[PDB]
Amino acid sequence: LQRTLVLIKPDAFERSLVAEIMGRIEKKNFKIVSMKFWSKAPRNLIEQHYKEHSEQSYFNDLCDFMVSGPIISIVYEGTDAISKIRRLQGNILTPGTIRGDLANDIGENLIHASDSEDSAVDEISIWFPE
Amino acid sequence: LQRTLVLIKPDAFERSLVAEIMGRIEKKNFKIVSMKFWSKAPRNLIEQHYKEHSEQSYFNDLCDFMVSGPIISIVYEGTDAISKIRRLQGNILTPGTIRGDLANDIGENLIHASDSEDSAVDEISIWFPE
Amino acid sequence: GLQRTLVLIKPDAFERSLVAEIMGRIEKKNFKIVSMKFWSKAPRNLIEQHYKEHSEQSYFNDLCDFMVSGPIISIVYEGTDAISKIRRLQGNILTPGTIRGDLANDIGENLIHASDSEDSAVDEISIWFPE
Amino acid sequence: GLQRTLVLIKPDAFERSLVAEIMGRIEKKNFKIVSMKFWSKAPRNLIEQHYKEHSEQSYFNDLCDFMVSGPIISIVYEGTDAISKIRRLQGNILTPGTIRGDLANDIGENLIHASDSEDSAVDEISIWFPET
Amino acid sequence: GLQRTLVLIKPDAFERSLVAEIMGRIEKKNFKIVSMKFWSKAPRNLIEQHYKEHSEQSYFNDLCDFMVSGPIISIVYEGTDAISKIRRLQGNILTPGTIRGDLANDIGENLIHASDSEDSAVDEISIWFPET
Amino acid sequence: GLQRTLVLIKPDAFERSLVAEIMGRIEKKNFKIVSMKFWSKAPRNLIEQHYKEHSEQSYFNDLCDFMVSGPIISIVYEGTDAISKIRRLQGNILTPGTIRGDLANDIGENLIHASDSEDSAVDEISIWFPE
Numbered sequence: 001l002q003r004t005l006v007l008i009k010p011d012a013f014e015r016s017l018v019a020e021i022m023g024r025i026e027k028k029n030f031k032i033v034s035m036k037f038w039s040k041a042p043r044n045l046i047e048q049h050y051k052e053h054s055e056q057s058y059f060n061d062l063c064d065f066m067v068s069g070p071i072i073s074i075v076y077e078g079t080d081a082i083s084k085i086r087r088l089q090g091n092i093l094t095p096g097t098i099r100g101d102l103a104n105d106i107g108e109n110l111i112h113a114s115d116s117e118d119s120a121v122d123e124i125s126i127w128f129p130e
Numbered sequence: 131l132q133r134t135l136v137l138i139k140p141d142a143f144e145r146s147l148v149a150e151i152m153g154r155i156e157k158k159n160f161k162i163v164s165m166k167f168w169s170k171a172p173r174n175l176i177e178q179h180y181k182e183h184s185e186q187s188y189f190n191d192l193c194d195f196m197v198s199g200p201i202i203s204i205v206y207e208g209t210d211a212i213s214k215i216r217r218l219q220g221n222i223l224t225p226g227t228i229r230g231d232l233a234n235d236i237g238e239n240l241i242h243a244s245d246s247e248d249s250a251v252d253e254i255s256i257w258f259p260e
Numbered sequence: 261g262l263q264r265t266l267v268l269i270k271p272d273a274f275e276r277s278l279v280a281e282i283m284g285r286i287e288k289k290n291f292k293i294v295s296m297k298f299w300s301k302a303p304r305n306l307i308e309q310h311y312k313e314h315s316e317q318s319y320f321n322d323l324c325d326f327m328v329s330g331p332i333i334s335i336v337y338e339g340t341d342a343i344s345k346i347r348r349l350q351g352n353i354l355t356p357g358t359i360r361g362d363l364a365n366d367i368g369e370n371l372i373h374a375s376d377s378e379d380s381a382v383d384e385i386s387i388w389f390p391e
Numbered sequence: 392g393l394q395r396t397l398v399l400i401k402p403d404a405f406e407r408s409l410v411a412e413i414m415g416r417i418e419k420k421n422f423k424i425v426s427m428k429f430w431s432k433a434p435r436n437l438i439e440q441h442y443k444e445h446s447e448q449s450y451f452n453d454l455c456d457f458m459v460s461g462p463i464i465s466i467v468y469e470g471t472d473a474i475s476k477i478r479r480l481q482g483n484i485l486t487p488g489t490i491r492g493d494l495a496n497d498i499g500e501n502l503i504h505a506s507d508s509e510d511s512a513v514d515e516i517s518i519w520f521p522e523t
Numbered sequence: 524g525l526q527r528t529l530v531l532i533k534p535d536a537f538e539r540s541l542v543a544e545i546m547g548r549i550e551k552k553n554f555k556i557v558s559m560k561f562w563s564k565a566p567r568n569l570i571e572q573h574y575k576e577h578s579e580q581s582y583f584n585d586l587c588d589f590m591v592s593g594p595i596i597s598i599v600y601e602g603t604d605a606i607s608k609i610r611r612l613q614g615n616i617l618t619p620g621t622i623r624g625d626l627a628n629d630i631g632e633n634l635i636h637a638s639d640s641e642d643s644a645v646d647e648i649s650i651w652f653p654e655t
Numbered sequence: 656g657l658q659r660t661l662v663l664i665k666p667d668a669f670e671r672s673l674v675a676e677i678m679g680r681i682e683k684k685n686f687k688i689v690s691m692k693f694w695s696k697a698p699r700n701l702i703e704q705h706y707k708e709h710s711e712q713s714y715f716n717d718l719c720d721f722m723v724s725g726p727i728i729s730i731v732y733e734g735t736d737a738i739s740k741i742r743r744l745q746g747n748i749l750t751p752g753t754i755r756g757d758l759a760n761d762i763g764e765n766l767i768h769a770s771d772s773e774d775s776a777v778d779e780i781s782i783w784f785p786e
């Protein structure tokens with residue numbers, strides 16, 4: 001039984017897919033543990049969240065995009081939660097997942113889910129320092 | 131163009147209807163303006179929110195219920211937003227609405243939506259004092 | 261005020277693959293299945309009892325003919341005020357939001373029966389669930 | 392008996408990605424497609440003919456500019472009582488359960504048009520499918 | 524050609540209100556119901572017969588106590604390649620797109636059983652529908 | 656990497672009322688309709704061109720027969736990497752999550768065609784949209 005961090009990206013709000021995305025996590029029996037609405041995320045928070053990528057050349061376009069609209073940060077709890085929600089997120093190639101059914105751009109891909117126990121602990125501390 | 135207050139009640143979490151409910155408001159083109167997750171709402175907040183009802187004999191069962199599980203408080207924005215989201219909420223008698231399609235008890239009815247300009251201003255100040 | 265009502269999923273439901281869709285609308289309003297029977301063909305006897313009140317109508321035989329034209333499922337549903345709330349779920353072909361309102365388009369081929377009163381329920385339930 | 396009626400999927404439907412959602416509700420009510428055309432941009436005179444009863448109203452020009460602001464789909468549907476049944480499906484932005492009731496929140500950007508009468512239906516059909 | 528297979532809707536499905544959701548996915552894949560029974564409580568020997576290949580495992584008793592903890596529905600489905608197609612629909616809790624992949628998160632509370640072979644299928648069917 | 660691909664909604668789609676469901680899956684993956692035509696009956700000519708590569712197969716005539724058995728809609732879709740992504744949406748009757756995976760159950764009656772490569776798209780698009 002784990003906790004993991006999810007961000008619902010601005011494009012979800014654009015395309016009104018917010019509930020669709022959350023619904024898929026709900027219908028798999030994961031529980032909201034805490035949650036925040038950000039009309040525009042503090043760019044500092046975004047930069048930390050993507051620190052890993054600061055050296056990639058796409059980094060700035062990424063931060064620009066993540067701050068160009070609302071986002072929701074969620075802490076989800078459930079059995080094998082990190083691994084499972086990752087699979088649920090999927091990729092824009094494989095049907096059945098969130099990115100597989102709804103997303104279409106390597107950049108505008110609707111959702112973030114932590115990919116490891118370390119990044120999960122880390123990403124939760126970023127959005128939910130308390 | 132108005133702002134209104136919505137609560138998603140504990141029974142929504144019980145029955146995993148949270149996204150279903152939010153989805154219906156999203157698909158009608160209303161926008162999240164701000165939002166809070168409460169694993170257990172401060173009973174003080176609940177009592178204020180339902181002050182109007184303190185004289186009714188059902189009052190305490192009501193507060194007990196509203197605090198027996200998570201709730202989400204949302205500020206929604208959109209044309210005629212107060213009136214419309216009210217209609218959307220509906221009642222447990224009329225199909226097509228949230229309560230009409232999903233709820234079934236006069237007490238456990240999934241959602242709250244402000245019913246007037248005054249109560250809307252008031253209810254937003256309660257959950258979102260800033 | 262807990263109650264019980266009798267529901268028939270009609271042959272057009274199977275024909276058109278709307279069995280899950282119909283039941284799911286009843287399930288989402290928090291009604292519980294209490295008894296259920298699948299009938300590949302319903303005894304013309306049982307049908308005529310079910311629609312005994314209509315025996316003196318022009319449409320009585322085409323009704324029966326149709327009700328035996330394919331499978332049907334009889335369900336006993338249970339929940340607060342079930343008799344009347346499931347009735348509103350069923351609705352009519354004129355009111356969007358209901359089962360007939362969204363999915364049906366014909367006076368006769370209309371997907372679902374639901375008891376219209378307590379007398380009818382107690383009565384209908386007996387027909388389909390003699391036990 | 393069988394009627395035919397004319398539907399237009401408006402540009403807001405394409406923008407908001409509700410084209411399948413809309414056609415879906417009509418499909419699930421057991422109505423069939425007889426004719427269908429996709430217009431990346433509907434010609435302005437077609438739009439102006441289609442709304443000709445509206446030609447004197449203040450909103451007339453803005454309406455047409457809107458209906459021309461993006462793609463539209465015109466569809467002839469066939470089904471029992473199609474005209475009235477599909478009018479009802481469309482509903483309005485005050486009626487939960489209908490297309491405009493669940494999905495629309497604007498007097499002008501309301502996703503869909505359907506013929507409102509036997510004659511307006513026959514008329515509207517010849518505009519979008521004159522080759523008959 | 525046509526096969527028949529046996530499905531069980533488990534008690535977790537009734538608790539979580541996913542009975543229509545589950546049957547729906549099989550219905551949309553074009554499989555037909557031939558037989559169906561609702562059990563408010565399935566008799567324990569039926570459950571124990573149904574899982575008899577499992578009788579030596581540690582989990583055997585807990586499994587049966589679970590399958591008896593609430594209602595279940597048994598269904599015979601008919602369709603082309605039904606056994607394998609419906610096994611695949613069920614999937615597992617690691618495979619998005621399937622019943623267990625989208626809706627389940629427990630090794631035991633996994634909503635649905637379907638026959639996994641021609642023989643297990645014929646066998647399982649006589650257990651729940653012995654009157655044939 | 657914007658692309659265009661040709662999609663056919665087959666006669667089983669209409670027969671079974673899955674036209675909106677199919678298109679909606681394409682719409683939700685953010686693909687845009689660029690051209691569209693409804694055909695109450697498709698010219699056996701156009702079909703045979705479309706399936707010219709299969710002309711030497713056992714199934715070639717039943718294929719054609721079926722493709723003319725009811726309406727079809729040809730759609731030109733457009734979006735990043737559309738040719739290949741719509742192909743994965745279409746999937747096969749063995750893989751849940753795809754159109755065929757969820758909705759189809761037959762080698763032949765399988766609801767939808769999508770271009771399998773750029774050559775096929777450019778080629779197919781021409782057949783159905785000569786203009």
Ligand SMILES: Cc1cn([C@H]2C[C@H](O)[C@@H](COP(=O)(O)OP(=O)(O)O)O2)c(=O)[nH]c1=O
Pocket residue numbers: 058062106107108109111112
């Ligand atoms: C790898 C990669 C990422 N990105 C951007 C878009 C993504 O939203 C974000 C994160 O990408 P990445 O960390 O590779 O994937 P995930 O979202 O599964 O963690 O960085 C690109 O724009 N191009 C790329 O090649």
Ligand SMILES: Cc1cn([C@H]2C[C@H](O)[C@@H](COP(=O)(O)OP(=O)(O)O)O2)c(=O)[nH]c1=O
Pocket residue numbers: 188192236237238239241242
């Ligand atoms: C009127 C009423 C309310 N309640 C409880 C349940 C409801 O969640 C809450 C509010 O009821 P009310 O203010 O009447 O309706 P709304 O939710 O539309 O504002 O009070 C009862 O339990 N019984 C009653 O008769």
Ligand SMILES: Cc1cn([C@H]2C[C@H](O)[C@@H](COP(=O)(O)OP(=O)(O)O)O2)c(=O)[nH]c1=O
Pocket residue numbers: 314319323367368369370372373
């Ligand atoms: C009234 C009527 C009913 N029927 C059929 C379909 C109905 O489900 C059944 C009884 O009709 P009715 O009492 O109108 O509907 P309900 O199912 O709501 O009781 O008989 C007709 O075929 N034609 C008719 O004119």
Ligand SMILES: Cc1cn([C@H]2C[C@H](O)[C@@H](COP(=O)(O)OP(=O)(O)O)O2)c(=O)[nH]c1=O
Pocket residue numbers: 450453454498499500501503504507
């Ligand atoms: C009344 C009205 C309609 N419209 C648009 C949206 C309507 O679909 C169309 C015709 O209006 P109207 O005839 O009132 O609505 P309906 O479409 O139900 O017949 O014109 C406006 O843009 N402004 C307006 O004030």
Ligand SMILES: Cc1cn([C@H]2C[C@H](O)[C@@H](COP(=O)(O)OP(=O)(O)O)O2)c(=O)[nH]c1=O
Pocket residue numbers: 582585586630631632633635636639
């Ligand atoms: C493996 C396993 C199964 N089960 C339950 C859930 C399974 O549906 C059933 C049989 O297990 P198994 O044969 O592994 O799964 P399947 O249902 O895919 O054949 O028993 C447990 O309760 N505990 C376990 O460790």
Ligand SMILES: Cc1cn([C@H]2C[C@H](O)[C@@H](COP(=O)(O)OP(=O)(O)O)O2)c(=O)[nH]c1=O
Pocket residue numbers: 709714718762763764765767768
């Ligand atoms: C291979 C094959 C195809 N068909 C039909 C249905 C297929 O959609 C069409 C071409 O077959 P195929 O190339 O296998 O499928 P796809 O549609 O993915 O190209 O011909 C058969 O009826 N039987 C067969 O064995």
Ligand SMILES: [Mg+2]
Pocket residue numbers: 115
């Ligand atoms: Mg990553």
Ligand SMILES: [Mg+2]
Pocket residue numbers: 245
């Ligand atoms: Mg009130």
Ligand SMILES: [Mg+2]
Pocket residue numbers: 376
């Ligand atoms: Mg009646």
Ligand SMILES: [Mg+2]
Pocket residue numbers: 507
């Ligand atoms: Mg009008």
Ligand SMILES: [Mg+2]
Pocket residue numbers: 639
């Ligand atoms: Mg097995």
Ligand SMILES: [Mg+2]
Pocket residue numbers: 771
């Ligand atoms: Mg191929």
